[PDB]
Design a protein around this ligand. Structure first.
Ligand code: CHL
Ligand code: CHL
Ligand code: CHL
Ligand code: CHL
Ligand code: CLA
Ligand code: CLA
Ligand code: CLA
Ligand code: CLA
Ligand SMILES: CC1=C[C@H](O)CC(C)(C)[C@H]1/C=C/C(C)=C/C=C/C(C)=C/C=C/C=C(C)/C=C/C=C(C)/C=C/C1=C(C)C[C@H](O)CC1(C)C
Ligand SMILES: CC1=C[C@H](O)CC(C)(C)[C@H]1/C=C/C(C)=C/C=C/C(C)=C/C=C/C=C(C)/C=C/C=C(C)/C=C/C1=C(C)C[C@H](O)CC1(C)C
Lengths: 201, 219, 219
């Protein structure tokens, strides 16, 4: 209930019953209670794969190995054609149970046999903790794809290019820079308009 | 088509001699009534034989697929070195250890005694926990557990599950007989079994078996 | 350190599966509870196995010391001819019979059939009198007699005597396994086991076992 801009409203179906509910849905996508049931696991799985991708994207660029946007380009691995067909069967098999175990139980688990908890670890109020970590990680992944972009160096290399350095080389002193200033100025003045929508009711 | 009952496909079918031994009449998969010597008259020993035959059948099916796959894969588009299952066990000694897939970016096992010790530890663990149960739920059934080893959930409907039992047993018997064939081909001709397949498909009747019949001649 | 009790050093230690088979719970030396096949469920057959294992253990310990001693003695300061235990059995055929210690002032057995007949006579006598008793007091115990075979008198204190039982059984198991090792070294490399010892101590890793792994290759 700390809203996404300090003094805000709550859209009329984002009450405090969801986990990460900071009351942000301006385009009215999830107006159903049937797509919320689905967008929640879209949120969790889209975030979850990215959480598992950030570790790899950092280690491959800390240890050595060639940069990720050209990872599979050159490949000492085996038979580019058919190992994707290996990457179809096991996955579709696994998807059968992911969607099936999504259907038969309520909106939480996925693995083949049960809601997967071989430990006695947290199945508690801290699912908001990992969906929070996930929605941090998704934003972290786009940044790396924008580093395979404009600068062309990896994460940790540009981390050295600016992050021991002053604010002389950052967004606004770079190729895609005049648009970000406009978007910052526009997004910042936007809750000042949303307040004007609901001040005059 | 009635294995679970008196009308099972008996060991001679139409020469069935419908006076079958009374210590097995259906109710278990694979009961084909072929007891000419009768070494499983005792019921607990019979249970031991069911468990033992299941273990043998699953191990032999695993071995049989392991004998069909790598040679075909190295024949189609990959290279292993000696994909034939003879010197695949000696691929660790030759030049650079056992490289999996024939690739120096995979297992690359240098010392076979490390594989040895780790294999003993892991196999003792899994066989002990196979007998007495343990992880993923304590073992309550020695024949077919029903716990988290079927992550798909095919064991809901009972008669299809029983048909799966019978298919499993028949596949296992075929696998055991076929691996015996693999071993005999390893002894007599000592060449690739799939090399044998290709050679017999190229030579259907001129080199059948009895060119390789005067090899182990005593004198 | 509690072999005579439920707290014995079990076959897996802290992987003990403390649900041990109930037909042995201490009270006898060497009971380590490792019954994976269970060929000694019957109690009288179990007694036969205790007696049989004791006989095997003592015979194998005698053979193992007989395999360590003569080679070392002939390597240190004496000569036997072939002190390695292979042709020590054929030392009677070579040139002058089997001279004990490598000395023509000792046994000097010329004809092996005389050793043969006297050995059968003596061994039948001693094994029959071992089963049913006889001299030096009639045998009242088949496992451990307690009569005049202990001329020093170490069997007074009971718990140290039981510890001696357990040491005897463990030493016998080790002797049996080691003699199996001797036999396998006799098969594979066919050289002196203590020659093997010296060669492996001189060559710890370059000639370990698997230079001698492509010898019995079928083709
Ligand atoms: C959790 C560790 C664990 C692992 C890695 C395995 C893995 C194995 N089990 Mg096992 N098991 C394990 C625990 C258990 N098993 C069993 C009961 C069985 C049976 C009956 C069989 C196996 C078989 C197997 C083998 C192939 C299974 C496919 C392989 C050695 C099969 C086998 O050995 O044939 C190849 C087989 O028939 N397991 C029980 C009792 C419910 C267990 C409990 O911990
Ligand atoms: C390392 C510890 C280890 C332990 C404690 C056990 C323990 C056990 N295993 Mg397991 N195993 C272990 C390792 C392994 N096992 C197996 C494979 C199997 C199988 C396949 C089976 C068992 C079974 C059993 C049980 C009883 C088997 C027995 O009496 O053996 C006594 C047997 C021998 C000492 C060797 C027998 C050889 C056999 C006669 C082959 C004969 C070959 C043919 C005649 C043909 C040969 C060539 C061709 C060309 C003619 C017992 C619980 C059986 C079971 O659970 O039944 C219910 C069972 O079916 N084990 C493998 C794969 C190599 C292992 C690798 O480490
Ligand atoms: C008096 C003649 C006599 C001789 C020369 C031997 C000598 C022998 N006994 Mg024997 N025994 C003899 C009488 C008897 N034994 C036994 C009971 C046993 C047992 C239980 C064992 C021997 C064993 C032996 C062997 C090694 C003993 C050390 C050796 C063959 C041991 C053996 O055979 O292993 C090498 C062994 O375990 N004896 C009894 C019953 C009390 C006897 C009564 O006459
Ligand atoms: C001459 C008459 C003679 C008589 C009547 C007996 C009578 C008896 N002996 Mg005795 N023995 C005799 C001479 C001798 N014995 C022995 C050594 C033993 C031992 C060690 C044991 C007996 C035992 C027994 C009893 C039952 C054994 C049996 O069933 O044999 C059937 C067995 C066979 C015909 C041969 C079995 C060979 C075995 C399978 C070896 C397998 C080898 C391995 C697989 C490895 C081989 C090579 C390596 C490299 C792999 C029985 C009272 C046993 C006992 O008292 O148990 C309570 C006992 O443990 N005897 C030797 C020393 C060579 C003798 C020399 O003359
Ligand atoms: C793409 C994955 C994804 C999905 C499916 C969801 C799904 C959801 N979020 Mg969500 N979220 C995400 C990522 C995602 N989130 C990320 C990355 C952040 C951090 C920036 C957030 C931050 C966030 C907050 C703060 C809140 C939600 C909420 C919600 C729920 C209700 C709102 C709704 O109807 O959304 C439906 C949305 C979709 C179906 C996504 C459609 C994707 C559009 C069409 C394309 C977007 C592309 C984008 C504009 C361009 C790239 C952006 C980049 C340049 C920055 C819904 C379950 C609200 C809620 O109930 O609390 C949990 C809420 O208050 N989210
Ligand atoms: C889950 C997402 C994910 C994905 C899709 C990939 C994908 C890839 N990784 Mg990778 N990686 C990940 C997570 C991931 N990784 C994580 C979390 C770590 C940290 C432990 C690493 C550490 C890592 C290293 C150190 C290397 C790769 C390499 C590779 C590439 C070769 C794949 C292969 O056959 O190697 C074998 C992979 C498997 C057998 C995966 C089976 C499970 C491939 C593009 C290799 C590469 O780029 O070489 C050119 C390489 O050297 N990755
Ligand atoms: C060791 C493997 C093994 C074992 C333990 C069993 C066990 C069993 N089988 Mg079986 N079977 C096997 C392999 C095995 N089978 C194979 C490979 C085939 C295909 C040829 C069959 C085909 C078969 C049929 C058709 C039937 C059985 C049946 C039975 C049951 C009663 C017979 C019995 O007491 O067998 C005891 C078996 C042994 C003690 C094994 C002894 C093995 C030694 C080494 C002798 C083998 C030498 C061999 C004959 C020489 C040629 C080998 C070559 C054919 C492979 C019992 C559960 C009957 C039943 O009711 O099913 C439940 C039945 O009708 N079996
Ligand atoms: C023929 C020799 C022999 C015999 C009769 C026995 C007899 C016995 N042992 Mg024993 N044991 C032996 C040698 C022998 N042992 C050796 C050499 C070792 C060391 C490896 C052990 C280690 C051992 C342990 C750790 C335990 C026993 C136990 C037992 C008792 C119950 C098991 C049983 O029924 O065995 C029946 C045995 C047979 C019928 C012998 C069959 C032999 C055939 C040829 C198969 C052997 C093939 C072999 C596995 C292949 C590799 C050989 C290599 C390992 C040497 C029983 C009194 C258990 C007990 O409670 O102790 C009192 C127990 O916990 N034994
Ligand atoms: C029933 C009856 C009845 C009447 O009455 C009497 C009689 C007749 C006696 C009986 C019979 C019996 C029989 C026949 C038996 C047989 C069996 C078998 C064959 C088994 C196999 C069995 C077999 C088996 C297990 C197998 C297994 C296998 C394996 C693991 C494998 C492995 C491998 C692989 C992967 C590959 C690589 O590279 C190598 C190797 C190493 C090769
Ligand atoms: C327990 C169990 C359980 C489960 O359940 C199952 C199973 C596994 C089957 C089982 C097992 C079993 C086993 C292992 C057995 C083994 C045994 C042995 C090794 C013996 C030896 C045994 C051995 C022995 C006696 C030995 C003896 C020896 C001798 C006399 C020697 C002699 C000699 C000498 C002086 C020297 C010279 O110059 C020469 C000679 C001639 C060389």
């Amino acid at each position: 209930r700390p809203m996404w801009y300090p003094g805000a409203t709550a859209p009329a179906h984002l009450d405090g019953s969801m986990l990460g509910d900071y009351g942000f849905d301006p385009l009215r996508l999830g107006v159903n209670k049937d797509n919320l049931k689905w967008f929640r696991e879209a949120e969790l799985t889209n975030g979850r794969w990215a959480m598992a991708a950030v570790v790899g994207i950092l280690f491959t660029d800390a240890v050595g190995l060639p940069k990720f946007w050209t990872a599979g380009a050159e490949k000492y691995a085996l038979d580019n054609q058919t190992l994707a067909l290996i990457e179809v069967a096991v996955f579709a098999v696994l998807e059968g149970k992911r969607y099936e175990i999504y259907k038969k139980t309520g909106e939480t688990g996925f693995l083949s046999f049960a809601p997967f908890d071989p430990m006695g670890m947290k199945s508690e109020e801290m699912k908001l903790k990992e969906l929070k970590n996930g929605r941090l990680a998704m934003l972290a992944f786009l940044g790396f794809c924008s580093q395979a972009a404009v600068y062309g160096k990896g994460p940790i290399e540009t981390l050295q290019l600016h992050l021991a350095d002053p604010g002389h080389n950052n967004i606004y002193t770079s190729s895609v820079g005049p648009e970000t200033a406009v978007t910052v100025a526009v997004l910042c003045v936007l809750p000042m308009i949303i307040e004007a929508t609901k001040t005059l009711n | 088509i009635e294995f679970y009952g008196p009308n099972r496909a008996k060991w001679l079918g139409p020469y069935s001699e419908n006076a079958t031994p009374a210590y097995l009449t259906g109710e278990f998969p694979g009961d084909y009534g072929w007891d000419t010597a009768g070494l499983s008259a005792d019921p607990e020993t019979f249970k031991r034989y069911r468990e033992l035959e299941l273990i043998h059948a699953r191990w032999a099916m695993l071995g049989a697929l392991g004998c069909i796959t790598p040679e075909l894969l190295a024949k189609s588009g990959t290279q292993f070195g000696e994909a034939v299952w003879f010197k695949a066990g000696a691929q660790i000694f030759s030049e650079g250890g056992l490289d999996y897939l024939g690739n120096p970016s995979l297992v690359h096992a240098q010392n076979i005694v490390a594989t040895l010790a780790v294999q003993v530890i892991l196999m003792g663990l899994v066989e002990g926990y196979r007998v007495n149960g343990g992880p993923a739920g304590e073992g309550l059934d020695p024949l077919y557990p029903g716990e988290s080893f079927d992550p798909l959930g095919l064991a809901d409907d009972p008669d299809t599950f029983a048909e799966l039992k019978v298919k499993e047993i028949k596949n296992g018997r075929l696998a055991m007989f076929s691996m015996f064939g693999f071993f005999v081909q390893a002894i007599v001709t000592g060449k690739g079994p799939i090399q044998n397949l290709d050679d017999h498909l190229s030579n259907p009747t001129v080199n059948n078996a009895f060119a390789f019949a005067t090899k182990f001649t005593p004198s």
